[PDB]
Structure 1
């Protein structure tokens, strides 16, 4: 009787997640924190660009451009 998206992100704290953003951006990282707007705090994050992988470390991601968030299987 309530949406479970929030419960899902809470369950993802500490897990690696795949995040895709507007303008064809693809990021992977450990989800450490997030808010109701889907703004995210990732650690050990990395960008995947045309097969290249660039480690970034800590990353704050604005929710407005997030397409989806998926815990890596």
Structure 2
């Protein structure tokens, strides 16, 4: 299901489906996962940005730098 040595496959298993991205310092994105690399840089389509639990705006496409990521959940 998730190769015990490849945690990032969890992202692969979720391509083109809705995911939750928790960022550092209270930000969060919810959108369709379209792409990602080993650094966890990733692209979401039709994404909503949330700050402190509230929606700030919706972005057609967004590239998130992996270094700002805390966790990802399908």
Does the TM-score normalized on the shorter chain lie above 0.5? yes
In the alignment, which residue of structure 2 is the partner of 1:5? 7
Structure-1 separation of matches of 2:56 and 2:17: 19
Give the structure with the larger helix fraction.
1
Offset of residue 56 of structure 1 = 1.0
TM-score (norm 2): 0.85
Structure-2 separation of matches of 1:43 and 1:55: 10
Question: SS at 2:12's partner residue?
Answer: helix
In the alignment, which residue of structure 1 is the partner of 2:40? 38
Q: RMSD of the TM alignment (CA)?
A: 1.6
TM-score (norm 1): 0.86
In the alignment, which residue of structure 2 is the partner of 1:69? 72
1:16-59 alpha-carbon deviations (Å, 9 max, x no partner): 11001111101101000000000011001111234335211100
Offset of residue 4 of structure 1 = 3.1
Structure 1 ranges of 4+ moved more than 3 A:
none
Q: Which runs of 5+ in 2 are unaligned?
A: none
Tell me the matched-pair count.
71
Structure-2 separation of matches of 1:15 and 1:42: 10
